[PDB]
Design a protein around this motif. Structure first.
Motif, PDB file in Angstrom:
ATOM      1  N   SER A   1       0.818  -1.212   0.000  1.00 56.51           N
ATOM      2  CA  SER A   1       0.000   0.000   0.000  1.00 56.51           C
ATOM      3  C   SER A   1       0.850   1.259   0.000  1.00 56.51           C
ATOM      4  O   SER A   1       0.563   2.220  -0.726  1.00 56.51           O
TER       5      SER A   1
ATOM      6  N   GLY B   1       2.348   2.013  -3.270  1.00 59.85           N
ATOM      7  CA  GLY B   1       1.391   2.617  -4.188  1.00 59.85           C
ATOM      8  C   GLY B   1       0.169   1.783  -4.548  1.00 59.85           C
ATOM      9  O   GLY B   1      -0.749   2.305  -5.170  1.00 59.85           O
ATOM     10  N   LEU B   2       0.139   0.510  -4.152  1.00 62.43           N
ATOM     11  CA  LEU B   2      -1.027  -0.346  -4.396  1.00 62.43           C
ATOM     12  C   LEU B   2      -2.300   0.298  -3.853  1.00 62.43           C
ATOM     13  O   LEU B   2      -2.308   0.789  -2.721  1.00 62.43           O
ATOM     14  N   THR B   3      -3.372   0.298  -4.647  1.00 60.86           N
ATOM     15  CA  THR B   3      -4.606   1.000  -4.250  1.00 60.86           C
ATOM     16  C   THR B   3      -5.761   0.093  -3.813  1.00 60.86           C
ATOM     17  O   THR B   3      -6.530   0.466  -2.916  1.00 60.86           O
TER      18      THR B   3
ATOM     19  N   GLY C   1      -4.566   2.214   3.793  1.00 58.56           N
ATOM     20  CA  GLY C   1      -4.507   2.867   2.483  1.00 58.56           C
ATOM     21  C   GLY C   1      -4.998   2.032   1.314  1.00 58.56           C
ATOM     22  O   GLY C   1      -4.671   2.328   0.163  1.00 58.56           O
TER      23      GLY C   1
HETATM   24 CA   LIG Z   1      -2.216   2.804  -0.972  1.00 59.89          CA
END
Ligand SMILES: [Ca+2]
Ligand SMILES: OC[C@H]1O[C@H](O[C@H]2[C@H](O)[C@@H](O)[C@@H](SC[C@H]3O[C@@H]4O[C@H]5[C@H](O)[C@@H](O)[C@@H](O[C@H]6[C@H](O)[C@@H](O)[C@@H](O[C@H]7[C@H](O)[C@@H](O)[C@@H](O[C@H]8[C@H](O)[C@@H](O)[C@@H](O[C@H]9[C@H](O)[C@@H](O)[C@@H](O[C@H]%10[C@H](O)[C@@H](O)[C@@H](O[C@H]3[C@H](O)[C@H]4O)O[C@@H]%10CO)O[C@@H]9CO)O[C@@H]8CO)O[C@@H]7CO)O[C@@H]6CO)O[C@@H]5CO)O[C@@H]2CO)[C@H](O)[C@@H](O)[C@@H]1O
Ligand SMILES: [Ca+2]
Ligand SMILES: [Cl-]
Length: 870
Positions: free
Chosen positions: A282, A285-287, A378
């Motif tokens: 997360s 950058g994993l959404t 996140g």
């Molecule tokens: Ca994230």
């Protein structure tokens, strides 16, 4: 199902494919289902149907294209249609056959009012849609196990049965007693059914819990303010997806308490190795996390005392290529805690086996705590929704609900009246109004009651396009003020596969890849998947692809001569490059022949367009998923046996990096980042915790834990055995951690520049260029440039404040390459700072030479170069 070759399509029209001459057709009805063949005997009423040479009207032939040529028969206005649809029905010619009723049931009884339980300050009411039923009552219970409390009759109004009771009905358990004609049994049967609109259930759905889903005690602390805490999502173009099974996530996690492994609660363990792993991704950058089916499905008992397990210590002593491990797993696979969960019973209720207690409120609160906890690190939550089929049908059994109540309606049937099974078994018919309604109502349930952030549609091609679009519209118009969630952020995608009875739009325009072009709904890109890995899910396992050694490193399986394999490699590279550019119809690529071709003009199986989308957000780019072999395993099968595990680790990274740096939406299978193996299991849905192990200690990847289960794998056991037995195939902790480190870094690279995530096809057409193309292309290299505004007087917006140009080189060759691109000469390119600082010492050697525009890239490496604005 018995013979039913005629269709009651509207209140006054019946369709039946008989010849001219066959003017003597009659409609017979028996309320008690007493008819037989003489000439029909034992009927209550007989009525002649007047033939209609006008044919079937527009609305019927549009709704049911497959019967558009059927002869139309007029039902006289004297016929009491509401009464007749509750009877055993046949038509006869002079040949006898039954009637398929969905058309007329929608025409007369389509209903938009309340269904399920409605709570008011002084009352609770129940509503059930059952227009063919002769009677409906509700049997109440005080508790999930105890004896009957009372039975109350429901009263019917236009197909809908209802009753209102006092507010003290709240928290009772109940079932519907439904008297209804069942074609499969040719009898009027008293069926005991759960509520299609259930929001909670006792263990295994034996009873429905009459719970008020809005009750404050079902809310985690700060639940109502979760919208304020949700991670920002500026655009669907920023989405990355991680596909994860709830049990896999924590079944082996020693940092989670033993009594809390495998379920919703495990996500509350923030300091667990598993949640620390998701935090790491997360942060990079994993959404989105896509969770495998988490609603009420069959195949796992909700009652934990019935769960059985293998002797893990014994199995650990067996050889890595032995068949004994799978024998032990298969011995308990029907009674263990494990299943992917693609066996739907009730869509609107969290799975009880994943709750701490399958009776009462824990399944609701713990599901909410899971969503809340993931949002708090996140990550947005995507649910895997399975609207395309049911686990069971018919009047009997705990696992049949929908078809118990209104038989032959929620399920799709063939022209003889037999239930369609192409999805797995008991295909649904979203083309029917109340099925479409139930699907959309369920989605809104999960969006509003559980604040779910997106949905992945299993076999979307089996769902009507109209259903998908109506759902999309309803979901995306939800607001925080009215509903507590920002619907504009809710993203939909699915499997747009097109086969069996829904092919050629035979049941209507279905949710296929081609039909969903221009809808903004994502679909899995199988073209890039197979071009990278090689072959297909149904082909020879040894067929090589762009990233598994085709031509460059042949594996000994015969795939043509050297010219054939070079051409096949180049063709795959074309398909990959269309995919890397968002898999668009209109994107123009210099193909491997030298001919400029649009994405739609490059063709795959059955002459279909490789690039089929109108926008990059319609493309889900992937090389791995829960279905078929894991990324590590497919690479281990297809590459030459003599490659080292170190080499194969680099190849794993290349595949995931092609996804991570693609235009469109990257999709990762949980474990891609840690070399996850299933010991080459191609269909691990019922292969238990043993073969599906996700090890967040990083000590193992689960390679070499025995041959996988024989039912789906035995034919390939000969290729598997020597590989599983070979110690050089198995990665150690060092490899696993290195794979994770490089995966985190490529995610960081994706989110370092808006140029990797262009929001429209126009942007991609203007900015994305491929630089190693044509008949004389350098085999095994893809060079992808992305342009931003530069110089004075630009022809495009400035999207990136740090970089004016980005070039990525994917080199699958086992040697260094030097790629000269004169058009990129005399520019300010340098290695991406992430790669400059990489723990991988090889990628650091990547270089650019200005005078020639030469990009030098080491073997089996992805190198990203950036032109700073400084
Ligand atoms: Ca994230
Ligand atoms: O199951 C009842 C159903 O069966 C048939 O329908 C199948 C249909 O014929 C078939 O094309 C696909 S359609 C979905 C699929 O679409 C794309 O695939 C295209 C391929 O990329 C392309 O190469 C080309 O495929 C051809 C093959 O190359 C060729 O070899 C030949 O395939 C044979 C095969 O050799 C033979 O073994 C057998 O296959 C059986 C398997 O051995 C069993 O394991 C099982 O298959 C399982 C599978 O293991 C599961 O993983 C799951 O499959 C999933 C895939 O994992 C998904 O990736 C997805 O598949 C997509 C591709 O991704 C996409 O590229 O969805 C699948 C279904 O959910 O479930 C499977 C079923 O249990 O059973 C099969 C029995 O069929 O037979 C096949 C031929 O059938 O021929 C094909 C060309 O046909 O073209 C592809 C596009 O067509 O799968 C359908 C579902 O099985 C009947 O037609 C249908 O009436 C019937 O109701
Ligand atoms: Ca199982
Ligand atoms: Cl457990």
């Amino acid at each position: 199902m018995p013979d039913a070759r005629a269709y009651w399509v509207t209140s006054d029209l019946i369709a039946w494919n008989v010849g001219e001459l066959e003017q003597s057709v009659c409609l017979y009805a028996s309320r008690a289902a007493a008819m037989s063949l003489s000439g029909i005997q034992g009927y209550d009423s007989k009525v002649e149907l007047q033939p209609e040479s006008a044919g079937l009207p527009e609305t019927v032939t549009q709704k049911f294209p497959f019967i558009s040529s059927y002869r139309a028969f007029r039902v006289p206005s004297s016929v009491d249609v509401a009464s007749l649809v509750k009877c055993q029905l046949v038509v006869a010619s002079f040949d006898v056959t039954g009637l398929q009723l969905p058309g007329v049931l929608d025409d007369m009884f389509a209903y938009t009012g309340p269904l399920g339980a409605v709570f008011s300050e002084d009352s609770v009411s129940l509503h059930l849609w059952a227009p063919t039923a002769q009677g409906v009552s509700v049997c109440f219970f005080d508790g999930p196990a105890g004896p009957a409390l009372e039975t109350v009759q429901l009263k019917e109004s236009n197909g809908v049965w209802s009753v209102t009771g006092p507010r003290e009905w709240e928290n009772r358990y109940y079932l519907y007693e439904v008297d209804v004609y069942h074609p499969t049994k040719a009898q009027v049967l008293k069926c005991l059914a759960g509520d299609p609109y259930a929001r909670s259930l006792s263990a295994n759905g034996a009873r429905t819990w009459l719970v008020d889903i809005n009750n404050e005690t079902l809310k985690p602390a700060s639940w109502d303010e979760l919208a304020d805490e949700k991670p920002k999502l500026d655009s669907f173009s920023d989405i990355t997806i991680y596909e994860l099974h709830i049990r896999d996530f924590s079944a082996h996690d020693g940092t989670v308490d033993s009594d809390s492994r495998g379920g919703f609660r495990a996500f509350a363990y923030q300091a667990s190795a598993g949640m620390e792993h998701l935090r790491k991704l997360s942060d990079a950058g994993l959404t989105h996390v896509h969770l495998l089916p988490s609603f009420h499905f069959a195949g796992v008992d909700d009652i934990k005392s019935n769960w059985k397990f293998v002797d893990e210590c014994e199995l650990a002593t067996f050889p890595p290529g032995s068949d004994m491990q799978q024998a032990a797993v298969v011995a308990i696979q029907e009674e263990d805690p494990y299943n992917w969960g693609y066996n739907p019973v009730l869509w609107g209720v969290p799975k009880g086996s994943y709750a701490s207690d399958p009776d009462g409120p824990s399944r609701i609160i713990e599901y909410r705590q899971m969503v809340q906890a993931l949002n708090r690190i996140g990550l947005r939550v995507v649910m895997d929704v399975v609207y395309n089929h049911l686990d069971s049908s018919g009047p009997c059994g705990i696992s049949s609900v929908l078809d118990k109540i209104v038989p032959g309606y929620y399920v799709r049937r063939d022209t003889n009246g037999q239930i369609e099974n192409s999805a797995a078994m008991n295909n649904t018919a979203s083309e029917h109004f109340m099925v479409d309604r139930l699907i959309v109502d369920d989605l809104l349930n999960w969006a509003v009651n559980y604040k779910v952030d997106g949905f992945r549609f299993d076999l979307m091609g089996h769902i009507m396009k109209r259903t998908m679009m109506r759902a999309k519209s309803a979901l995306q118009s939800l607001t925080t003020d009215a509903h507590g969630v920002d619907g504009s952020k809710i993203y939909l995608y699915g499997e747009g596969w097109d086969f069996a009875e829904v092919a050629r739009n035979q049941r209507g325009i279905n949710g296929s890849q081609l039909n969903m072009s221009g809808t903004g709904i994502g679909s899995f890109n199988d073209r890039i998947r197979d071009a990278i890995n090689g072959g297909n899910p149904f082909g020879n396992p040894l067929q090589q692809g762009f990233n598994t050694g085709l031509f460059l490193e042949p594996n000994g399986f015969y795939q043509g001569n050297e010219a054939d394999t070079r051409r096949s490699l180049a063709t795959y590279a074309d398909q990959i490059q269309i995919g890397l550019a968002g898999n668009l119809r209109d994107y123009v690529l210099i193909s491997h022949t030298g001919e400029a071709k649009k994405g739609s003009e490059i063709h795959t199986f059955d002459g279909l367009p490789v690039g089929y989308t109108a926008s990059p957000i319609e493309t889900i780019n992937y090389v791995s998923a829960h279905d078929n072999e894991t990324l590590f395993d497919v690479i281990s099968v297809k590459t030459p046996m003599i490659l080292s595990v170190d080499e194969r680790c680099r190849i794993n990274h290349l595949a995931s990096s092609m996804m991570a740096l693609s235009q469109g939406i990257p999709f990762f299978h949980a474990g891609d980042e840690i070399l996850r193996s299933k010991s080459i299991d191609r269909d691990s849905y019922n292969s238990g915790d043993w073969f599906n192990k996700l090890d967040f200690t990083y000590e193992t990847n689960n390679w070499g834990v025995g041959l996988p289960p024989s039912e789906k794998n035995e034919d390939n056991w000969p290729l598997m055995k020597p590989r599983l037995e070979n110690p050089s195939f198995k990665p150690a902790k060092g490899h696993i951690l290195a794979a994770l480190d490089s995966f985190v870094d490529i995610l960081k690279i994706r989110y370092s520049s808006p140029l990797f995530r262009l929001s429209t096809a126009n942007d991609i057409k203007q900015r994305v260029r491929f630089h190693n193309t044509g008949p004389s292309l350098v085999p095994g290299v893809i060079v992808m440039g992305i342009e931003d505004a530069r110089g004075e007087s630009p022809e495009m917006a400035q999207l990136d404040t740090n970089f004016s140009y980005v070039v990525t080189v994917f080199n699958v060759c086992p040697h260094e390459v030097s790629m000269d691109i004169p058009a990129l000469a005399s520019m300010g390119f340098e290695l991406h700072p992430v790669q400059v600082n990489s723990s991988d010492t090889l990628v650091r050697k990547s270089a650019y030479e200005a005078a020639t525009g030469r990009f030098t890239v080491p073997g089996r490496t992805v190198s990203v170069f950036v032109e700073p604005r400084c």
